[PDB]
Design a protein around this motif. Sequence first.
Motif, PDB file in Angstrom:
ATOM      1  N   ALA A   1       0.834  -1.206   0.000  1.00 41.68           N
ATOM      2  CA  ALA A   1       0.000   0.000   0.000  1.00 41.68           C
ATOM      3  C   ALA A   1       0.871   1.260   0.000  1.00 41.68           C
ATOM      4  N   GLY A   2       2.074   1.165   0.561  1.00 45.40           N
ATOM      5  CA  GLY A   2       2.956   2.297   0.748  1.00 45.40           C
ATOM      6  C   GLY A   2       2.970   2.860   2.157  1.00 45.40           C
ATOM      7  N   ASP A   3       2.121   2.344   3.058  1.00 42.40           N
ATOM      8  CA  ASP A   3       2.076   2.719   4.471  1.00 42.40           C
ATOM      9  C   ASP A   3       2.551   1.587   5.379  1.00 42.40           C
ATOM     10  N   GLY A   4       3.294   0.627   4.841  1.00 37.84           N
ATOM     11  CA  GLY A   4       3.736  -0.519   5.597  1.00 37.84           C
ATOM     12  C   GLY A   4       2.813  -1.719   5.545  1.00 37.84           C
ATOM     13  N   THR A   5       1.620  -1.595   4.987  1.00 44.48           N
ATOM     14  CA  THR A   5       0.742  -2.745   4.869  1.00 44.48           C
ATOM     15  C   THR A   5       0.677  -3.192   3.390  1.00 44.48           C
ATOM     16  N   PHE A   6      -0.081  -4.267   3.137  1.00 39.28           N
ATOM     17  CA  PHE A   6      -0.124  -4.927   1.841  1.00 39.28           C
ATOM     18  C   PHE A   6      -1.573  -5.133   1.387  1.00 39.28           C
ATOM     19  N   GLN A   7      -1.727  -5.383   0.078  1.00 40.02           N
ATOM     20  CA  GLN A   7      -3.021  -5.595  -0.561  1.00 40.02           C
ATOM     21  C   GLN A   7      -2.928  -6.747  -1.568  1.00 40.02           C
ATOM     22  N   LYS A   8      -4.072  -7.375  -1.823  1.00 39.62           N
ATOM     23  CA  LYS A   8      -4.131  -8.446  -2.812  1.00 39.62           C
ATOM     24  C   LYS A   8      -5.588  -8.636  -3.229  1.00 39.62           C
ATOM     25  N   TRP A   9      -5.802  -9.033  -4.484  1.00 39.95           N
ATOM     26  CA  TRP A   9      -7.148  -9.457  -4.846  1.00 39.95           C
ATOM     27  C   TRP A   9      -7.118 -10.681  -5.747  1.00 39.95           C
ATOM     28  N   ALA A  10      -8.275 -11.331  -5.812  1.00 43.34           N
ATOM     29  CA  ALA A  10      -8.457 -12.521  -6.627  1.00 43.34           C
ATOM     30  C   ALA A  10      -9.837 -12.400  -7.276  1.00 43.34           C
ATOM     31  N   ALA A  11      -9.951 -12.757  -8.557  1.00 38.34           N
ATOM     32  CA  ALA A  11     -11.225 -12.598  -9.278  1.00 38.34           C
ATOM     33  C   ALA A  11     -11.572 -13.858 -10.060  1.00 38.34           C
ATOM     34  N   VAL A  12     -12.866 -14.006 -10.336  1.00 37.23           N
ATOM     35  CA  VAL A  12     -13.416 -15.102 -11.127  1.00 37.23           C
ATOM     36  C   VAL A  12     -14.609 -14.569 -11.911  1.00 37.23           C
ATOM     37  N   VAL A  13     -14.762 -15.049 -13.149  1.00 38.50           N
ATOM     38  CA  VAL A  13     -15.886 -14.679 -14.018  1.00 38.50           C
ATOM     39  C   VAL A  13     -16.950 -15.755 -13.902  1.00 38.50           C
ATOM     40  N   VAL A  14     -18.189 -15.351 -13.663  1.00 32.05           N
ATOM     41  CA  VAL A  14     -19.224 -16.330 -13.346  1.00 32.05           C
ATOM     42  C   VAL A  14     -20.460 -16.002 -14.169  1.00 32.05           C
ATOM     43  N   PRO A  15     -21.312 -16.986 -14.399  1.00 28.16           N
ATOM     44  CA  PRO A  15     -22.578 -16.705 -15.078  1.00 28.16           C
ATOM     45  C   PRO A  15     -23.516 -15.894 -14.178  1.00 28.16           C
ATOM     46  N   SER A  16     -24.157 -14.881 -14.767  1.00 24.57           N
ATOM     47  CA  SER A  16     -25.148 -14.102 -14.029  1.00 24.57           C
ATOM     48  C   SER A  16     -26.237 -15.026 -13.501  1.00 24.57           C
ATOM     49  N   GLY A  17     -26.583 -14.859 -12.231  1.00 25.36           N
ATOM     50  CA  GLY A  17     -27.547 -15.719 -11.579  1.00 25.36           C
ATOM     51  C   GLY A  17     -26.938 -16.839 -10.760  1.00 25.36           C
TER      52      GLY A  17
END
Lengths: 99, 274, 9
Positions: free
Chosen positions: B236-252
């Motif tokens: 992040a630049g303030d000493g902490t960290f970030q991460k994300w994970a994504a998946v594409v799914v059918p609507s509904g």
Amino acid sequence: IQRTPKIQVYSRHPAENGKSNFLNCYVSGFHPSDIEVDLLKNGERIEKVEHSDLSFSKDWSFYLLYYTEFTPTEKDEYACRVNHVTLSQPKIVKWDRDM
Amino acid sequence: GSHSMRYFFTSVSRPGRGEPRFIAVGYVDDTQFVRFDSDAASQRMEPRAPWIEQEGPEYWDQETRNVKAQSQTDRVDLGTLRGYYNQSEAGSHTIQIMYGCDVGSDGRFLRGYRQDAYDGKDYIALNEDLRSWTAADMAAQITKRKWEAAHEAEQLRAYLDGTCVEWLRRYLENGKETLQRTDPPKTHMTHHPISDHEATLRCWALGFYPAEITLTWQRDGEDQTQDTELVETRPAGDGTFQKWAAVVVPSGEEQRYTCHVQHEGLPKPLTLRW
Amino acid sequence: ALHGGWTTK
């Protein structure tokens, strides 16, 4: 022997128009270490940009953080422009604030 | 928890453009605390964490001398390895070195390490027993014979399982107010249609320390090993960290997917569902 | 603190 940078563009804190923040461009997984990174505001190079000290991961690929203080607005467009020997032209990654 | 101290060194030749670029960084855990950059103005080892600034002028002089000796040794090694690998003087090449030690939560030595690379590939490493080397190819074996004859492992071992541990314990005490903090990730999920019929689900972990974390997507409890996009963990630049994970799914069908978040600061692993 | 002493490769 050559690995192309993975580029992420993001703010330090969740972004809110009108509030000072930091715009980050994190480049990782690249080799060799020579790289040029600019942060762009409405297409123009930002001049006050700092970066971290070069370091590297377990697979020996490098990473760097470039960053500048900013106040996001609705209309201003930000991007990170990265040039590296692996790229046929400088890669421009727009800040996607809506993710 | 356990702790680590690590120094990272990079030397990059720049033929016809002066001497090699040399950058050294020291970390305790995921917190940088010193740096040296051959292109910076001071030509000194410099502090990068508040709790190292109390070290006296004898410390900064010694660290500066010793990082400059590492630089001079790498400069020589760049020329040597170019010979071993039968390369010309025209091209730019890179040496990277990492070494350090780990201690347990009660301060005991756990592990020491040292590994070297050339042009981003393994060159030579100290084995975990701190007595033997492993060379990556027949060129690196020349260095191994030299280091065996010099009894380099014994000298390095006295540092990695002795001196290194002694300094890491001092820094953890210098820095206690901040190095023993763990910050658990703050998590949420977002949803973004990509068409009338599909949407991206993205699992977010923010504000966590240390950097180590695991994000995984399941569908009806089955790990969706592929089909997931996962970014590198980032500061992040303030000493902490970030991460994300994504998946594409059918609507509904969003509610068949779950994101699972593991981090040493979490009492139970977290499960998120849209 | 850094290790001192340097055997060239």
